[PDB]
Design a protein around this ligand. Structure first.
Ligand code: NI
Length: 358
């Protein structure tokens, strides 16, 4: 890289665009710029996340189906995270998702940023804008966009994607949505929610929103000072993650320790979000997780998020409120209002979930 590129990447004021870490990584710096150093710790945990087989889950043989339903129910209660295998998503499609996204991140910055973002429109390539000097930046580049419903797709964003990536993403969206609905429907059965009689789970997600985050984590020279994706719990319904290459990075919090997730070949990693925990009246758990970086290999992933529609009324499903499981969370806000409230929230204090507790 040339000296002007270096200055553009490193001499950053508040209000400037967060720079590309894939570009920063080419500078091969001895120490990472100060903004990537995490300022404010749990130990590492061979206990691994459960595996759920979708063929078993959908088996026409009731004993097979019931066993897998017990496994799903267990994983959602006790782990909040599970791998899915025999998931029905064609191997060729998965290969194309991997190759086209690898292809995409290997394009020039000019080619990755052809979409003209509207003021306040944060979709496409980019982590956003620098907020303050004490803001910590993730060691990661991102491409984020809404994928369902169709009218939430930014048409000019979609038109500026390479054609094979766009077509593959469109197919992947459909398969991810189908898979999410298989899982929502089975979670509803595991919870004994009679969707015909009462306001259940699946009806909230069937016409809900879907979004994708494509993530590129370059190698980092000081991987014990930086983070790929800061510790968080997912806000919405069900997340389905594909790890694109064989580089480990995803870690989940279990009993005050960090546990590595090594995705299986031909597996997706699925987790419960905060809104899903609420809807289940705390029976299913949304778990803290993070992505770490390393000094030798880039890591890639794509996460597909399945959330309520913006006007879905959120609360614990009524048949899950019982004398043995009393109502833990408030009811009655729309999903869109919860999203907006969480953006402000309270500077100091508690998690979104704890803020919603009765
Ligand atoms: Ni997450």
């Amino acid at each position: 890289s040339n000296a002007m590129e270096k200055a553009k990447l490193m001499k950053l004021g508040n209000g400037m665009e967060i720079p590309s870490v894939q570009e920063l990584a080419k500078l091969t710096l001895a120490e990472i710029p100060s903004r990537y150093v995490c300022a404010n710790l749990l130990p590492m945990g061979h206990e691994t996340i459960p595996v759920i087989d979708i063929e078993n889950l959908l088996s026409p043989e009731p004993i097979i189906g019931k066993l897998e339903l017990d496994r799903l129910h267990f994983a959602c209660k006790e782990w909040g995270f599970f791998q899915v295998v025999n998931h029905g998503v064609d191997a060729s499609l998965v290969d194309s998702v991997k190759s086209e996204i690898q292809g995409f991140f290997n394009l020039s910055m000019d080619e990755k940023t052809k979409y003209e973002q509207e003021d306040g429109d944060v979709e496409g390539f980019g982590q956003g804008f620098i907020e303050s000097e004490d803001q910590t930046l993730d060691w990661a580049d991102i491409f984020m966009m809404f994928t369902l419903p169709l009218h939430l797709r930014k048409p000019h964003l979609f038109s500026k994607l390479p054609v094979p990536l766009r077509e593959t993403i469109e197919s992947y969206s459909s398969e991810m949505k189908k898979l999410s609905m298989v899982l929502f429907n089975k979670m509803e059965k595991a919870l004994q929610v009679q969707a015909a009689e009462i306001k259940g789970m699946s009806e909230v997600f069937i016409d809900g929103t879907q979004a994708m985050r494509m993530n590129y984590y370059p190698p980092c020279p000081q991987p014990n000072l930086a983070i790929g994706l800061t510790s968080h719990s997912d806000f919405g319904g069900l997340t389905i993650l594909l790890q694109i290459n064989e580089v480990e990075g995803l870690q989940i919090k279990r009993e005050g320790t960090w546990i590595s997730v090594k995705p299986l070949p031909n597996a997706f990693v699925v987790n419960v979000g905060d809104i899903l925990e609420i809807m289940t009246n705390g029976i299913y758990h949304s778990v803290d997780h993070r992505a770490v970086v390393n000094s030798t290999n880039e890591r890639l992933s794509i996460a597909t998020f399945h959330d309520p529609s913006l006007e879905s009324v959120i609360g614990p499903i009524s048949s899950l409120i019982t004398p043995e499981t009393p109502a833990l969370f408030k009811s009655g806000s729309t999903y869109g209002d919860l999203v907006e409230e969480c953006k402000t929230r309270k500077l100091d204090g508690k998690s979104f979930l704890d803020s919603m507790r009765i």
